[PDB]
Amino acid sequence: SLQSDQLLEATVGQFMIEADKVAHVQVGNNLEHALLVLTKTGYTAIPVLDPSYRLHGLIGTNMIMNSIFGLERIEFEKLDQITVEEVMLTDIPRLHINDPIMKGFGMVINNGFVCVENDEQVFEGIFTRRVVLKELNKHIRS
Amino acid sequence: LEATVGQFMIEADKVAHVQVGNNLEHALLVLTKTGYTAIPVLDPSYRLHGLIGTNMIMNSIFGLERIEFEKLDQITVEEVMLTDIPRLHINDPIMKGFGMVINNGFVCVENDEQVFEGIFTRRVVLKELNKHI
């Protein structure tokens, strides 16, 4: 939809995957629910929102397993005792729909995907390494 | 550009791996402690046999209203690992590796003996594409 000479002036929002196509979980859900959504959907991490649909963090299976790998056994009972808010990653920089695409491009170096929000922290979608690679590979060819 | 995969791959001795014959609980533990979502499975000859991944393991123990963690140390990685994986050579052009990491977090590099040499990752490609543009 965009030619090569338009790519570098686009915004993050024009290439993000929209929120209604991304499974998410809630800060108050337990880890078993998060693990089921991660396993069923097959994502490396999943957005964590509050009830107002606002973005709080990211949770992945490695975070969940780290909290239940116990001394002598896997303590699976803790999946029903710990909430995603206690385990999620919160130290991700925030990315906005109107931010220039290069800001997204730099952020996905260290982060597999970044959740995108608007100016009220409402979750709008995700910006991924694959999105960047898929679009860049199209334009390096041309 | 004119660069090769080998010039930017992460060398094999820097990459976490497990062995054929190891059980899924050990694989899951290595994946968890290292933060990887998939890691190579090697044999005693350092040859690449496949990739074992966190979602692969979880899906194999998705049981009746519960996750069957007790099965993990009784199932070996070779029963669950992905063997239909792309592979690169050290002299492959970087644009060839670029194309292969669109749909793969990383791609393993190996020589003609299938000896594992390293991995070519999305992160390294993006880090270099940052400077090219």
Curated annotation (Swiss-Prot), chain A:
Keyword Secreted recorded: no
Description of activity control: Binds c-di-AMP. Binding of c-di-AMP to DarB inhibits the interaction with RelA and PYC.
Outcome when changing residue 36 to F: Binds c-di-AMP. Abolishes the ability to bind RelA. Is still able to bind PYC, but cannot activate it
Keyword Signal belongs to the record: no
Binding-site residues, 3',3'-c-di-AMP: 21, 23, 44-45, 129
Domain of life (superkingdom): Bacteria
CBS domain ranges (all copies): 16-76
Gene3D superfamilies from the UniProt entry: CBS-domain
Keywords noted in UniProt: CBS domain
Domain notes for this protein: No conformational changes occur upon c-di-AMP binding.
Quaternary structure and partners: Homodimer. Forms a homodimer with a parallel, head-to-head assembly of the monomers. Under conditions of potassium starvation and corresponding low c-di-AMP levels, apo-DarB specifically interacts with the N-terminal region of the RelA. Under the same conditions, apo-DarB also specifically interacts with the C-terminal part of the pyruvate carboxylase.
Role played: Involved in the c-di-AMP-dependent regulation of the bacterial stringent response. Modulates the activities of at least two enzymes under conditions of potassium limitation. Apo-DarB regulates the activity of the GTP pyrophosphokinase RelA by interacting directly with RelA, leading to stimulation of (p)ppGpp synthesis and induction of the stringent response.
PANTHER family (UniProt xref): CBS DOMAIN-CONTAINING PROTEIN CBSX3, MITOCHONDRIAL, CYCLIC DI-AMP RECEPTOR B
Protein name: Cyclic di-AMP receptor B
Organism in which the protein naturally occurs: Bacillus subtilis (strain 168)
Gene that encodes the chain: darB
